[PDB]
Amino acid sequence: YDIQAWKKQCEELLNLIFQCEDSEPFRQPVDLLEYPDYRDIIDTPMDFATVRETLEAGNYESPMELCKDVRLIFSNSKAYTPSKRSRIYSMSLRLSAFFEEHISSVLSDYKSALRFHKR
């Protein structure tokens, strides 16, 4: 019932995501020089370095907030892709499946810890 355990669990999951080749297009903000119309479609850019920095600065209160930012990386990729068959979008789908498979226990354990704290 450790209410703080999610933070190191998220740090370790972000480390795995950074080791994965599929994360390369998402490790840093999208390059506006390569994609000059990016901000005409995407209102809120997000990337894994920003997620990691926000976590390390102590600026997430819960793993749900981290999960909302990670999911924004994937929805941005889906909204900017010109095709559902594109390379970068295809990498986003595999990364998303891996992230969701691993974040599920983090969220469940945190929510269970909070419910126990308030019993």
**Residues of the shown chain interacting with ligand UUJ in the complex, contacts defined by CB under 6 A:** 16-17, 20, 22-23, 94-95, 98
* 38 or 98: CB nearest ligand UUJ: 98
Q: What are phi and psi of 98, to 5 degrees?
A: -65, -45
CA distance 87 to 84: 9
CB of 39 to ligand UUJ, least distance (A): 26
Assess contact for 54 and 39: CB atoms under 8 A: no
Structure tokens at 20: 């994965």
Assess contact for 95 and 103: CB atoms under 8 A: no
* 17 or 46: CB nearest ligand UUJ: 17
Residue with token string 């740090």: 11
* 21 or 43: CB nearest ligand UUJ: 21
* 42 or 93: CB nearest ligand UUJ: 93
CB of 21 to ligand UUJ, least distance (A): 7
CB of 92 to ligand UUJ, least distance (A): 9
Assess contact for 105 and 5: CB atoms under 8 A: no
CB of 78 to ligand UUJ, least distance (A): 15
